[PDB]
């Protein structure tokens, strides 16, 4: 067993969007990426 075993749920109920619009730290994450101009905001 090596590591990166994917799921379609868990990579959107941890690293999604709605769990970065839930705190005052996901908002730091999104506004820190928008000042990099990156296309993919979050997975």
Query: Is residue 42 within the footprint of RNA (CB under 7 A)?
Result: yes
Tokens of 37: 């101009």
How far is it, in rounded angstroms, from Cα 14 to Cα 1? 22
Q: Which of 1, 3 has the CB closer to RNA?
A: 3
> Do residues 30 and 41 touch, judged by C-beta distance below 8 A?
yes
Residues 13-32 that bind RNA (CB under 7 A): 15, 29, 32
Query: Is residue 1 within the footprint of RNA (CB under 7 A)?
Result: no
What is the number of residues in the chain? 43
Which residues of the chain form contacts with RNA (CB under 7 A)? 3-4, 6-9, 11, 15, 29, 32-34, 36-40, 42-43
């Amino acid at each position: 067993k090596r590591t990166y075993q994917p799921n379609k749920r868990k990579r959107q109920k941890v690293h999604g969007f709605r769990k970065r619009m839930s705190t005052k730290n996901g908002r730091r994450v999104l506004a820190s990426r928008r000042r990099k101009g990156r296309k993919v905001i979050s997975a």
